[PDB]
């Protein structure tokens, strides 16, 4: 019952055992990190305008993907110990692997695309930026959502 604009607009303040609440602030290292990631990459999806900005913007994005990579794993973890249930906890540890790695794989790659935006040869590299960022932005929200309800699914498993 808390104003958080997730996918399809579902809004919550998880009502379960306090570790699931702790899987709501530690997951707010992700739940607040996802909905911020899909807003600044949303600023880079087409408001990408400057090669000079492309250098450090992708870096902050890459550090945010890197931030997101080890945030989504950090959200999917603590519930699985307080999870009375096992079946609904499988996805989170998978997402703790899958969502982290998929974010991780681009988190480094965004850096190798931030370095290519570092020097900033706007003749072609911006077309690199525009193609993976949306690809990532499509991938990150896809990866977000898959965890974004699998991370609460473990918190749901961690209810009692």
């Amino acid at each position: 019952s808390a104003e958080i604009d997730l996918g399809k607009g579902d809004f919550r303040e998880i009502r379960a055992s306090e570790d699931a609440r702790e899987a709501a602030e530690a997951l707010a290292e992700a739940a607040r990190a996802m909905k911020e990631a899909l807003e600044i990459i949303r600023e880079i999806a087409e408001k990408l305008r400057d090669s000079s900005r492309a250098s450090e913007a992708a870096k902050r994005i890459a550090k945010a993907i890197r931030k997101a990579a080890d945030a989504i794993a950090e959200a999917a973890k603590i519930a699985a110990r307080a999870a009375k249930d096992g079946d609904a906890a499988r996805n989170a540890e998978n997402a703790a692997r899958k969502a982290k790695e998929f974010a991780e794989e681009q988190a480094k790659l965004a850096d190798m695309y931030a370095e290519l935006a570092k020097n900033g040869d706007k003749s072609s590299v911006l077309e690199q930026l525009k193609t993976f960022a949306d690809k990532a932005f499509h991938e990150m929200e896809d990866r977000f959502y898959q965890a974004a309800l699998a991370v609460f699914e473990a918190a749901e498993a961690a209810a009692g």
Binding site: G7, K8, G9, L109, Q128, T131, D142, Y145, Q146, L149
Partner: protein
Amino acid sequence: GFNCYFPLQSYGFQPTNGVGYQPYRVVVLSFEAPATVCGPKKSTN
């Protein structure tokens, strides 16, 4: 990858996906020699 991309892209359709992400069904009918397709003209008593 890495400056090389498939011309494809997968919609990820899961039971939980956002309502704006869930699959939607769309019909687009085109209007446009003899003209044969005609609306039903209702008769009368």
